[PDB]
Design a binder for these strands. Sequence first.
RNA 1: GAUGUCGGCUCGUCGCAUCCUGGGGCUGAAGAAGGUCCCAAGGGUUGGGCUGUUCGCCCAUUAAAGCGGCACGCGAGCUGGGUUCAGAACGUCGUGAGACAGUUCGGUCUCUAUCCGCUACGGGCGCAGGAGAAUUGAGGGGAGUUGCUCCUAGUACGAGAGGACCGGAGUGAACGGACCGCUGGUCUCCCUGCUGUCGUACCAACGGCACAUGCAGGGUAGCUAUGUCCGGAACGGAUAACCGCUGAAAGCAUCUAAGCGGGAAGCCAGCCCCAAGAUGAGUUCUCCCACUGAAGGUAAGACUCCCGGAAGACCACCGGGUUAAGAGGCCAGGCGUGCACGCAUAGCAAUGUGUUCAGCGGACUGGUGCUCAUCAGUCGAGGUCUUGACCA
RNA 2: AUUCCUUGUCGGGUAAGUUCCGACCUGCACGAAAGGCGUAACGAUCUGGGCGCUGUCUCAACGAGGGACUCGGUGAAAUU
RNA 3: AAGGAACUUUGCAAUCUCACCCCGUAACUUCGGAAGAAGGGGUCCCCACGCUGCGUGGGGCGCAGUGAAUAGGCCCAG
Lengths: 134, 118, 206, 57, 115
Amino acid sequence: MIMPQSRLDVADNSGAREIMCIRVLNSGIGGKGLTTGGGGNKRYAHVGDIIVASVKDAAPRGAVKAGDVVKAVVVRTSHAIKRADGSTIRFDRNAAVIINNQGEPRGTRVFGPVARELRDRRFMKIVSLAPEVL
Amino acid sequence: QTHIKINRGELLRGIEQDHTRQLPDFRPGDTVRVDTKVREGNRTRSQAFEGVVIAINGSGSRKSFTVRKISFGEGVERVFPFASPLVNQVTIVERGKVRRAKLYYLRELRGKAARIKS
Amino acid sequence: MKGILGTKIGMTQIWKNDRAIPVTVVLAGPCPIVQRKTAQTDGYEAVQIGYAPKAERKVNKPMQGHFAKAGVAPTRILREFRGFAPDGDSVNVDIFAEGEKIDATGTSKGKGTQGVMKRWNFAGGPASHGSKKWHRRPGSIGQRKTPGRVYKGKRMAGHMGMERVTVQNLEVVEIRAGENLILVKGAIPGANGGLVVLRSAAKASA
Amino acid sequence: KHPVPKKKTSKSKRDMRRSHHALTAPNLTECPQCHGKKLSHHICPNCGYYDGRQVLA
Amino acid sequence: MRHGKAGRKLNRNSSARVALARAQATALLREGRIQTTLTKAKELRPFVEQLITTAKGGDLHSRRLVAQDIHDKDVVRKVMDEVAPKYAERPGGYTRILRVGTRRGDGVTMALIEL
RNA sequence: GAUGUCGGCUCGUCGCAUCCUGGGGCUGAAGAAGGUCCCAAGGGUUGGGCUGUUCGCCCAUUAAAGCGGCACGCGAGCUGGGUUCAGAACGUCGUGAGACAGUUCGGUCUCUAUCCGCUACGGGCGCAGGAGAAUUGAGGGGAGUUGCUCCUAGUACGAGAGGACCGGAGUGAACGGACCGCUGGUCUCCCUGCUGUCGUACCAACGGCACAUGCAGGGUAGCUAUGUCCGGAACGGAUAACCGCUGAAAGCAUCUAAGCGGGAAGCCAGCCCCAAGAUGAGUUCUCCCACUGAAGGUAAGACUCCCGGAAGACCACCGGGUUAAGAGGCCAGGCGUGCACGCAUAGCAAUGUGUUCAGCGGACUGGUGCUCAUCAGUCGAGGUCUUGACCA
RNA sequence: AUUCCUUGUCGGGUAAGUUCCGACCUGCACGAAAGGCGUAACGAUCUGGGCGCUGUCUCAACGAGGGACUCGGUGAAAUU
RNA sequence: AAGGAACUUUGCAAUCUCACCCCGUAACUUCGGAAGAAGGGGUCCCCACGCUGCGUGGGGCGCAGUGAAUAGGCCCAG
Ligand SMILES: CC[C@H]1OC(=O)/C=C/[C@H](C)[C@@H](O[C@@H]2O[C@H](C)C[C@H](N(C)C)[C@H]2O)[C@@H](C)C[C@@H](C)C(=O)/C=C/[C@H]2O[C@@H]2[C@@H]1CO[C@@H]1O[C@H](C)[C@@H](O)[C@@H](OC)[C@H]1OC
Ligand SMILES: [Ca+2]
Ligand SMILES: [Ca+2]
Ligand SMILES: [Ca+2]
Ligand SMILES: [K+]
Ligand SMILES: [Mg+2]
Ligand SMILES: [Mg+2]
Ligand SMILES: [Mg+2]
Ligand SMILES: [Mg+2]
Ligand SMILES: [Mg+2]
Ligand SMILES: [Mg+2]
Ligand SMILES: [Mg+2]
Ligand SMILES: [Mg+2]
Ligand SMILES: [Mg+2]
Ligand SMILES: [Mg+2]
Ligand SMILES: [Mg+2]
Ligand SMILES: [Mg+2]
Ligand SMILES: [Mg+2]
Ligand SMILES: [Mg+2]
Ligand SMILES: [Mg+2]
Ligand SMILES: [Mg+2]
Ligand SMILES: [Mg+2]
Ligand SMILES: [Mg+2]
Ligand SMILES: [Mg+2]
Ligand SMILES: [Mg+2]
Ligand SMILES: [Mg+2]
Ligand SMILES: [Mg+2]
Ligand SMILES: [Mg+2]
Ligand SMILES: [Mg+2]
Ligand SMILES: [Mg+2]
Ligand SMILES: [Mg+2]
Ligand SMILES: [Mg+2]
Ligand SMILES: [Mg+2]
Ligand SMILES: [Mg+2]
Ligand SMILES: [Mg+2]
Ligand SMILES: [Mg+2]
Ligand SMILES: [Mg+2]
Ligand SMILES: [Mg+2]
Ligand SMILES: [Mg+2]
Ligand SMILES: [Mg+2]
Ligand SMILES: [Mg+2]
Ligand SMILES: [Mg+2]
Ligand SMILES: [Mg+2]
Ligand SMILES: [Mg+2]
Ligand SMILES: [Mg+2]
Ligand SMILES: [Mg+2]
Ligand SMILES: [Mg+2]
Ligand SMILES: [Mg+2]
Ligand SMILES: [Mg+2]
Ligand SMILES: [Mg+2]
Ligand SMILES: [Mg+2]
Ligand SMILES: [Mg+2]
Ligand SMILES: [Mg+2]
Ligand SMILES: [Mg+2]
Ligand SMILES: [Mg+2]
Ligand SMILES: [Mg+2]
Ligand SMILES: [Mg+2]
Ligand SMILES: [Mg+2]
Ligand SMILES: [Mg+2]
Ligand SMILES: [Mg+2]
Ligand SMILES: [Mg+2]
Ligand SMILES: [Mg+2]
Ligand SMILES: [Mg+2]
Ligand SMILES: [Mg+2]
Ligand SMILES: [Mg+2]
Ligand SMILES: [Mg+2]
Ligand SMILES: [Mg+2]
Ligand SMILES: [Mg+2]
Ligand SMILES: [Mg+2]
Ligand SMILES: [Mg+2]
Ligand SMILES: [Mg+2]
Ligand SMILES: [Mg+2]
Ligand SMILES: [Mg+2]
Ligand SMILES: [Mg+2]
Ligand SMILES: [Mg+2]
Ligand SMILES: [Mg+2]
Ligand SMILES: [Mg+2]
Ligand SMILES: [Mg+2]
Ligand SMILES: [Mg+2]
Ligand SMILES: [Mg+2]
Ligand SMILES: [Mg+2]
Ligand SMILES: [Mg+2]
Ligand SMILES: [Mg+2]
Ligand SMILES: [Mg+2]
Ligand SMILES: [Mg+2]
Ligand SMILES: [Mg+2]
Ligand SMILES: [Mg+2]
Ligand SMILES: [Mg+2]
Ligand SMILES: [Mg+2]
Ligand SMILES: [Mg+2]
Ligand SMILES: [Mg+2]
Ligand SMILES: [Mg+2]
């Protein structure tokens, strides 16, 4: 449950370190890079959901500067996330990893763990930079 | 309504012992939940989760425990149904001395010296 | 066509091939075939059928004659199923299978007189910026002179719940045949202990 | 604001509200022990019985 | 709505509906029977009835549990030493209600609660 | 002798000159993507910055971000930013008092619904005897949105780049119904911790007040969403624009002049809910019978009264009422809190340890005749006539 | 607080700024005790932004108490 | 719950902060002030030691020690 205005933390070494949401999309990877669409009224981002976001606060030196409109994917909800077995996960803090219109990450590494759902949701290479799934 | 004379809980208990699994006694010790991640292809990966246990909940096929770890500098909790087929088994790293049944207060202590006893 | 009656026992957790699946448990107890109604005699095709047993001191003489006509120890409840033309009596076992979709009808747990925010999802008013009707209340109800009235079928505070409700296409997780139990994926309308009618899917979903 | 009634009500129309103000007679019963007067599932007020004496009177 | 709540507001707040039932329980045990509104008697029953099952314990713990609801040391000794031992045969039927007439100031049906 | 004004909010409902989706003709229509006209009003039509704004510009998305009507819909429904009462200021006009549809800061929006309309719920009578139950469905309401991906298929088409219709499968969004197993919320006294003070003579141990819980920490049932399950349909019939078959008025040609087939998110039906006050009052099963003198005792059956209820403002509805487990208590179990009091021990003590997975206990599952459902009263049939048939 | 045209033009802040800050000046219609420009401190003054925190909101829920409901007692009003 | 002004004319309302001790505090200034700037730390119980209820130390319990009540939200710019 991310919605616009909600700041997130950034899980990558691309220069940004603090993005504010600005839009919640409903698209994903689909053989031509990112799909468009899903409708235009979905109101909460879950892990594995793409969002758009302004880059409020960024590290000097580094590939993404403040004010940049950006398409991150969220990797860490404080909101709980449930599995088909019945397992639940929750992380203490909300965080996302900025990407580009192929879905590839923009930094050279991910920081902290990432939800296993990104593997379902086909972000095959953000999972690769990730120290742990779960 | 429909006032059949019947023991309701007994009928619930009887379609539920078949989905109940008993675990080693713990309270909030420390724990290795050696578990299963078959989401990795058609093959079965194994992973393990080790942290302080902060809650027991429910009864019968509804029992769950809440463990709480810190991976890579970011606090994480997780909730395991005892009779989940993705919980292979559980064992106690080390017993802890505590005065509650919950430990929610541990969430905002989040630091090395703010740690469960013995 | 196929149907039977039962009581709503409760809702628990259960695994099937390693995926948790909430289930409502229903007692689909044996159902005697009381009255049997043909179009040739009664102008339409259906079968009457009964459920909770009832001690005969508690029974009307006319109802005793109705059950005695067929030869059935009297039951507290009776219902009809159109098109269902069985033979013998109606056990849970024989007429359902693992994995049929089936419609599940029951009587909604009833919630009294409710406001428009609960009964109909109204927005209700701002809770600040000075405004009595600080929530809860319906707003405008009409236009003005040249509609002249308020609309029929309008939406306003009323008796919410306590209604008949079908739920389409619930899945049959398990049949424990001998005990007359039946597990069913998801949530049947009603309350524990209540009457429920399990029936074929009304829609032949492809 | 301030709703107020529009015309006076007719004697006919007001009396047919009151169509429902009829008091229900108590269903009284005869005390098997005292002389008479008793209200059901209650003590007999005169003698005090409710199978023997209860209240003092 | 209230699909399974038990208990009564007695057009009274939390602090009072206890200090009622404590004060009424003290009088029933101090008097054997009392006469009160039919409703307060219906709520008074299970509280006093549980309270004397506490005293059927005999030991000091049960005495001090009774003491935290009943602050008159005499009635405490009466229930603890006189009545509860008298009832130690008695699977819980320790109270009955009769309901008397109907009063005249407010027209409220009233009733007896006795042992 | 008063029809309250802009804008916002809240509720909707209607037109179609259709923004999306659906079906068609022509195209300077290869495909793909479009243009434009015809039919189509079922449903859908996003969140934000600036401004009182309506409009409009921008942000970021969308299938789409339609136009209007309903006193420029809606102030006995709410605001009160704009404006249009007194104060005050600037600019400008006026010698002045004062002044403009110029700006600017401030500035009382009136507890009780009588009738109709509307949402829910009863009472009466009616429905040619008095009753307990099961129902047909006249008729009426609800619902109706859409994307993305995959197979067909890198196929038809196209120099290439690109790249389909048709048919089939999967997964969402928003909406809605139900539900509480799951994840959480709350659970005003169910459990525990804590401070000041007052009390139970003192110690120990407890109670009150500090909120209408003193504060904190958890929390069962219930209720609840952000939580979960299900849905929108498939098939059919008649159609719109349109597409065709047989074919004349004209030995040609023509979808038409008789006639006939196809053809939409629309119409009717199918899905869910109400429904015989459908006064046209329907059908079926079962019961009580033919009493006495419009009545009165009674049958079948109900009600009144009590004890309760996942029913509920009241009524109504369901269950139990001694041939009784209905509710409470009591027993056992669950679940919640988290190891009681007392005693012993260790320590100068604060405290620690043991006895003790202890103690305590709302609403949960059963069992149990300890409590109360005692006694009893009040109602409630004798069935109109006419015509037809069939047996008397 | 004066500017009609006007959301003047550039820049700042914002993802986006008719508001606001800074320049510019073409001042409809500033201007020197109806005082002109400045000023630290002061302000229940007015205007714009930021941090913190929040049921203000997405989008409402559950709980409490006082009314609203029921019964016994007393029993109005505007209006017609 | 997750979110945190997305509400709105306006953060209006309602949070937040809160008392005393210690450390530390900017532009700018009429050299007084801005200033309680901002910020960070302490707060209970026992014992021993020094001093005139403090202080130094050691130990103890709780999620928490102005343990409940009274008792600032702050900053930049006009
Ligand atoms: C807020 C409550 C008070 O309502 C008003 O102020 C004004 C109400 C209405 C709306 C308005 O009518 C409107 O007029 C417009 C010009 C036209 C309009 N359209 C229909 C076209 C019409 O709607 C009035 C001018 C007309 C009339 C009734 C009247 O003059 C009323 C006088 C006031 O008493 C009342 C009320 C009592 O509250 C008072 O409040 C004070 C502060 C307290 O001290 C109280 O005790 C002393 C009490 O003082 C009396
Ligand atoms: Ca009325
Ligand atoms: Ca009254
Ligand atoms: Ca929170
Ligand atoms: K439960
Ligand atoms: Mg039972
Ligand atoms: Mg602890
Ligand atoms: Mg209810
Ligand atoms: Mg609201
Ligand atoms: Mg009219
Ligand atoms: Mg008005
Ligand atoms: Mg009262
Ligand atoms: Mg006496
Ligand atoms: Mg006991
Ligand atoms: Mg108690
Ligand atoms: Mg007039
Ligand atoms: Mg008027
Ligand atoms: Mg005007
Ligand atoms: Mg048209
Ligand atoms: Mg088209
Ligand atoms: Mg094309
Ligand atoms: Mg918009
Ligand atoms: Mg409109
Ligand atoms: Mg006009
Ligand atoms: Mg208007
Ligand atoms: Mg009006
Ligand atoms: Mg104003
Ligand atoms: Mg002049
Ligand atoms: Mg003011
Ligand atoms: Mg004002
Ligand atoms: Mg009011
Ligand atoms: Mg009032
Ligand atoms: Mg007839
Ligand atoms: Mg009849
Ligand atoms: Mg019909
Ligand atoms: Mg009609
Ligand atoms: Mg192939
Ligand atoms: Mg292929
Ligand atoms: Mg080719
Ligand atoms: Mg297709
Ligand atoms: Mg939903
Ligand atoms: Mg709903
Ligand atoms: Mg819960
Ligand atoms: Mg308490
Ligand atoms: Mg003491
Ligand atoms: Mg104590
Ligand atoms: Mg006192
Ligand atoms: Mg006092
Ligand atoms: Mg307080
Ligand atoms: Mg609490
Ligand atoms: Mg032809
Ligand atoms: Mg045709
Ligand atoms: Mg056809
Ligand atoms: Mg069709
Ligand atoms: Mg469709
Ligand atoms: Mg008739
Ligand atoms: Mg008669
Ligand atoms: Mg009888
Ligand atoms: Mg009843
Ligand atoms: Mg009964
Ligand atoms: Mg008896
Ligand atoms: Mg028995
Ligand atoms: Mg127990
Ligand atoms: Mg010692
Ligand atoms: Mg019980
Ligand atoms: Mg201007
Ligand atoms: Mg800029
Ligand atoms: Mg600008
Ligand atoms: Mg604004
Ligand atoms: Mg303004
Ligand atoms: Mg300027
Ligand atoms: Mg001047
Ligand atoms: Mg001058
Ligand atoms: Mg001056
Ligand atoms: Mg100046
Ligand atoms: Mg002043
Ligand atoms: Mg400000
Ligand atoms: Mg802003
Ligand atoms: Mg409520
Ligand atoms: Mg009087
Ligand atoms: Mg008068
Ligand atoms: Mg924040
Ligand atoms: Mg807005
Ligand atoms: Mg805003
Ligand atoms: Mg203002
Ligand atoms: Mg304020
Ligand atoms: Mg200096
Ligand atoms: Mg200085
Ligand atoms: Mg200042
Ligand atoms: Mg500690
Ligand atoms: Mg501390
Ligand atoms: Mg305090």
